[PDB]
Scaffold this active site. Structure first.
Site, PDB file in Angstrom:
ATOM      1  N   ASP A  73     -51.129 -71.986  30.496  1.00 36.17           N
ATOM      2  CA  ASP A  73     -50.162 -71.644  29.458  1.00 36.17           C
ATOM      3  C   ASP A  73     -50.123 -72.737  28.401  1.00 36.17           C
ATOM      4  OD1 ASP A  73     -48.671 -69.746  28.108  1.00 36.17           O
ATOM      5  OD2 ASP A  73     -46.779 -70.303  29.097  1.00 36.17           O
ATOM      6  N   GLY A  93     -35.177 -73.483  27.260  1.00 29.71           N
ATOM      7  CA  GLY A  93     -36.528 -73.563  27.796  1.00 29.71           C
ATOM      8  C   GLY A  93     -36.836 -72.254  28.495  1.00 29.71           C
ATOM      9  N   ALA A  94     -38.058 -72.118  29.027  1.00 26.74           N
ATOM     10  CA  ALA A  94     -38.499 -70.892  29.716  1.00 26.74           C
ATOM     11  C   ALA A  94     -37.584 -70.484  30.868  1.00 26.74           C
ATOM     12  CB  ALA A  94     -39.929 -71.053  30.220  1.00 26.74           C
ATOM     13  N   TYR A  95     -36.928 -71.452  31.534  1.00 23.12           N
ATOM     14  CA  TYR A  95     -36.079 -71.110  32.682  1.00 23.12           C
ATOM     15  C   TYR A  95     -34.585 -71.476  32.491  1.00 23.12           C
ATOM     16  CZ  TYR A  95     -39.002 -68.802  36.211  1.00 23.12           C
ATOM     17  OH  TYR A  95     -39.746 -67.880  36.903  1.00 23.12           O
ATOM     18  N   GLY A  96     -34.180 -71.707  31.251  1.00 24.37           N
ATOM     19  CA  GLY A  96     -32.777 -71.962  30.979  1.00 24.37           C
ATOM     20  C   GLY A  96     -32.472 -73.081  30.025  1.00 24.37           C
ATOM     21  N   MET A  97     -31.206 -73.496  30.042  1.00 19.57           N
ATOM     22  CA  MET A  97     -30.678 -74.512  29.166  1.00 19.57           C
ATOM     23  C   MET A  97     -31.270 -75.887  29.448  1.00 19.57           C
ATOM     24  SD  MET A  97     -26.707 -75.362  28.298  1.00 19.57           S
ATOM     25  CE  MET A  97     -26.121 -75.078  29.931  1.00 19.57           C
ATOM     26  N   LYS A 153     -33.255 -80.249  32.488  1.00 17.68           N
ATOM     27  CA  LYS A 153     -33.491 -78.800  32.511  1.00 17.68           C
ATOM     28  C   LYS A 153     -32.697 -78.243  33.693  1.00 17.68           C
ATOM     29  CE  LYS A 153     -37.798 -78.003  33.458  1.00 17.68           C
ATOM     30  NZ  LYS A 153     -39.262 -77.713  33.503  1.00 17.68           N
TER      31      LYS A 153
HETATM   32  C1  LIG Z   1     -42.179 -78.550  28.632  1.00 21.44           C
HETATM   33  C2  LIG Z   1     -41.526 -77.658  27.610  1.00 21.44           C
HETATM   34  C3  LIG Z   1     -40.024 -77.785  27.591  1.00 21.44           C
HETATM   35  O1  LIG Z   1     -39.370 -78.097  28.585  1.00 21.44           O
HETATM   36  N1  LIG Z   1     -39.485 -77.525  26.394  1.00 21.44           N
HETATM   37  C4  LIG Z   1     -38.118 -77.547  26.029  1.00 21.44           C
HETATM   38  C5  LIG Z   1     -37.563 -76.441  25.375  1.00 21.44           C
HETATM   39  C6  LIG Z   1     -36.288 -76.520  24.843  1.00 21.44           C
HETATM   40  C7  LIG Z   1     -35.558 -77.690  24.949  1.00 21.44           C
HETATM   41  C8  LIG Z   1     -36.076 -78.785  25.626  1.00 21.44           C
HETATM   42  C9  LIG Z   1     -37.352 -78.719  26.195  1.00 21.44           C
HETATM   43  N2  LIG Z   1     -37.864 -79.817  26.939  1.00 21.44           N
HETATM   44  C10 LIG Z   1     -37.833 -81.131  26.554  1.00 21.44           C
HETATM   45  N3  LIG Z   1     -37.432 -81.402  25.305  1.00 21.44           N
HETATM   46  C11 LIG Z   1     -37.435 -82.692  24.933  1.00 21.44           C
HETATM   47  N4  LIG Z   1     -37.161 -82.943  23.642  1.00 21.44           N
HETATM   48  C12 LIG Z   1     -36.854 -81.934  22.630  1.00 21.44           C
HETATM   49  C13 LIG Z   1     -36.134 -82.558  21.440  1.00 21.44           C
HETATM   50  C14 LIG Z   1     -35.924 -81.498  20.386  1.00 21.44           C
HETATM   51  O2  LIG Z   1     -37.169 -80.907  19.975  1.00 21.44           O
HETATM   52  C15 LIG Z   1     -37.793 -80.249  21.081  1.00 21.44           C
HETATM   53  C16 LIG Z   1     -38.131 -81.236  22.173  1.00 21.44           C
HETATM   54  N5  LIG Z   1     -37.748 -83.754  25.706  1.00 21.44           N
HETATM   55  C17 LIG Z   1     -38.150 -83.478  26.950  1.00 21.44           C
HETATM   56  C18 LIG Z   1     -38.217 -82.171  27.410  1.00 21.44           C
HETATM   57 CL1  LIG Z   1     -38.731 -81.846  29.020  1.00 21.44          CL
END
Ligand SMILES: *CCC(=O)Nc1ccccc1Nc1nc(NC2CCOCC2)ncc1Cl
Length: 340
Positions: A139, A24-28, A44
């Site tokens: 954003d 994600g924008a701020y890490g794993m 996160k």
């Molecule tokens: C709000 C954007 C964000 O946090 N995106 C993100 C980037 C990379 C990994 C995970 C997240 N957040 C997140 N992902 C999921 N599900 C995934 C499943 C695989 O496909 C991408 C979404 N669920 C909740 C959150 Cl907060």
């Protein structure tokens, strides 16, 4: 403490069976089994305390998401951190686990007109609440829209959000860097600090165009190419719209360009619903003052099957820069105390 690909991910004992999702924008970000609620969640990891700007962004994300309560905004289910400010080096934010994001979905899936309509309704429904709180997301983009298996949509990442301030929005030419390039309103490059609700509407228009074709509508290669892509489709701004641009550098830049004609939306999107194109046109209006507002967009005929103002809630309490990282660390510690 459990480890995930060479990095500590200390969330136990409540959260077990960790699996890496992505960056994600701020890490794993990992998924984990919540032994209390008996479901898998997203976690996160944020490590912001060495940099003031990282602290500012983390504080905004937490304070905003803890105040907001809406079906179309990702919530914060839990926050994990050490019991004392001295031992707090990382913060873990726990959120509902979603199936995908609109970025990933647009890379491999064709969306039916029904999915486009439903997704746009949900984005606008969440944006109505956000804007009713006097907040600008700033954003909005496909990677910040999460989807579950039944196509329920949640807006995420409020780290770049600001309280709206239309009176202090004016600035010089080529100074501002608000939003992600492809989703940046033309006024950001010309004379706007991105402190008005119209910036978010532009990003939504961009997202709608991208759902219609599976390709970004304004894919500027760099900062200075973004306006060229916008004008390449919208055509040259009218005299009335230029009269709104009083800053001479921005005005003269626009006057120096050769006349460009408007590319009709129906030619760009021949498979699109005509009502979707009328709404797209109102969202992708060059002049921010003439651009449609979120409540008007919800009332547009394209969204008539979903429109229900009594079921499009507003915030109960709206929201009304140089703090050192030490003070921001204390504020993050105080905002996360409720989860201890
Ligand atoms: C709000 C954007 C964000 O946090 N995106 C993100 C980037 C990379 C990994 C995970 C997240 N957040 C997140 N992902 C999921 N599900 C995934 C499943 C695989 O496909 C991408 C979404 N669920 C909740 C959150 Cl907060």
């Amino acid at each position: 403490p459990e480890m995930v690909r060479g990095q500590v991910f200390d969330v136990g004992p409540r959260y077990t069976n960790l699996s890496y999702i992505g960056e994600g924008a701020y890490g794993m970000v990992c998924s984990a089994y919540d032994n209390l609620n008996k479901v898998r969640v997203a976690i996160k990891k944020i490590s912001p305390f060495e940099h003031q700007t990282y602290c500012q962004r983390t504080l905004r994300e937490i304070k905003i998401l803890l105040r907001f309560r809406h079906e179309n905004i990702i919530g914060i289910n839990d926050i994990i951190r050490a019991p004392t400010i001295e031992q707090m080096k990382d913060v873990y934010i726990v959120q509902d686990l979603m199936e995908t994001d609109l970025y990933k979905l647009l890379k491999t899936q064709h969306l039916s007109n029904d999915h486009i309509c439903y997704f746009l309704y949900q984005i606008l429904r969440g944006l109505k609440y956000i804007h009713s709180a006097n907040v600008l997301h700033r954003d909005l983009k496909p990677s910040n829209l999460l989807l579950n298996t039944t196509c329920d949509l949640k807006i995420c990442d409020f780290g770049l959000a600001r309280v709206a301030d239309p009176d202090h929005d004016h600035t010089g030419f080529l100074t501002e860097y608000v939003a992600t390039r492809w989703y940046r309103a033309p006024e950001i490059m010309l004379n706007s600090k991105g402190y008005t609700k119209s910036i978010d509407i532009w990003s939504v228009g961009c997202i709608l165009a991208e759902m219609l074709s599976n390709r970004p509508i304004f894919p500027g290669k760099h900062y200075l190419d973004q306006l060229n892509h916008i004008l390449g489709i919208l055509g040259s701004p009218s005299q009335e719209d230029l009269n709104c641009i009083i800053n001479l550098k921005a005005r003269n830049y626009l006057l120096s360009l050769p006349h460009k004609n408007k590319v009709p939306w129906n030619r760009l999107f021949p498979n699109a619903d005509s009502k979707a194109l009328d709404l797209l046109d109102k969202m992708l209006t060059f002049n921010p003052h003439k651009r449609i507002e979120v409540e008007q967009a919800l009332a547009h005929p394209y969204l008539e099957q979903y429109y229900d103002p009594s079921d499009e809630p507003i915030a109960e309490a709206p929201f009304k820069d140089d703090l050192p990282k030490e003070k921001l660390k204390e504020l993050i510690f105080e905002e996360t105390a409720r989860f201890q």
